[PDB]
From a paper:
In the current study, we focused on the previously poorly characterized lipoprotein [name], which is known to be highly immunogenic protein recognized by sera from Lyme disease patients, but which does not have sequence similarity to any other known proteins in other organisms and is one of the 10 members of [name]. [name] and another [name] member, BBG25, show less sequence similarity with the other [name] members and in contrast to the other eight [name] members, which are most likely cytosolic membrane proteins, [name] and BBG25 are lipoproteins attached to the outer membrane of [name].
Crystals of [name] were obtained by using the recombinant protein BBA1426–121, which corresponds to the full-length protein except the N-terminal signal peptide. The crystals were in space group P41212, with one molecule per asymmetric unit. In the obtained crystal structure, the last three C-terminal residues 119–121 were not modeled due to weak electron density, while at the N-terminus, also the residues Ala-Met-Gly remaining after TEV protease digestion were modeled. The fold of [name] is formed by two α-helices, designated αA and αB, comprising 27 and 30 residues, respectively. The α-helices are connected by a 20 amino acid loop region; thus, αA and αB are placed in parallel. Additionally, there is an N-terminal loop region comprising 15 amino acids; given that [name] is a lipoprotein, this loop likely serves as a flexible region that connects the folded region to the cell membrane. By comparing with the available 3D protein structures deposited in the Protein Data Bank (PDB) using PDBeFold, the crystal structure of [name] revealed a structural similarity with the antitoxin epsilon from the toxin-antitoxin system in Streptococcus pyogenes. [name] and the antitoxin epsilon from S. pyogenes showed high overall fold similarity (Cα root-mean-square deviation of 2.90 Ǻ) but only 20% amino acid sequence identity. In addition, the predicted structure of [name] (all the predictions were done before the crystal structure of [name] was deposited in the Protein Data Bank (PDB)) corresponded very well to the crystal structure of [name] (Cα root-mean-square deviation of 0.63 Ǻ).
Residue numbers in the entry:
A (entry chain A), B (entry chain A): 24 to 118
The structure:
């Protein structure tokens, strides 16, 4: 069924909507990172693209609506780095 | 968009079809595990269900069609342990 879709942002900016969205984004990053690491293992030519592993030290741990919104930003910025690479490696190796 | 769907098994039992399926299954497990760990952090009542973290030492590293098929089995057995828990925690906390 191909790679999973990036989670969609809730309409509702409630603590629970945003907390769930943070969890999905973290989970989606881990799917993409795992896919990139496992695909590197199977075809490990020196050409294999370079990716940042997400640094969880950039995530606030305190459950504030403010800290959740800040984490969402950090996760979205990381997705923008790795999603295009994941999608290119998926195509390269499903060819 | 809810939790992602478990990857579907290819029709084709080719090395490439099975290797890609192994990568998706590993990636899907990491999505579910991350979702379970992040959801435990947000609601950490003593009731929170108990899950096995996947042991990558149970995975063969040698790219044999035989070793890939064996890894697929191990990953599918782990999904059967954690998918129902992930789906229940998703509902509990999207309530």
């Amino acid at each position: 069924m191909g790679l999973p879709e990036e989670p969609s942002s809730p309409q509702e900016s409630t603590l629970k909507a945003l907390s769930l969205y943070e969890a999905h984004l973290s989970s989606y990053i881990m799917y993409l990172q795992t896919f990139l690491v496992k695909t590197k293992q199977k075809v490990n030519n020196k050409n294999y693209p370079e990716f940042t592993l997400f640094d969880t030290s950039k995530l606030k741990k305190d459950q504030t609506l403010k800290s959740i919104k800040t984490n969402i930003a950090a996760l979205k910025n990381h997705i923008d780095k790795i999603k295009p690479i994941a999608m290119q490696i998926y195509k390269k190796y499903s060819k």
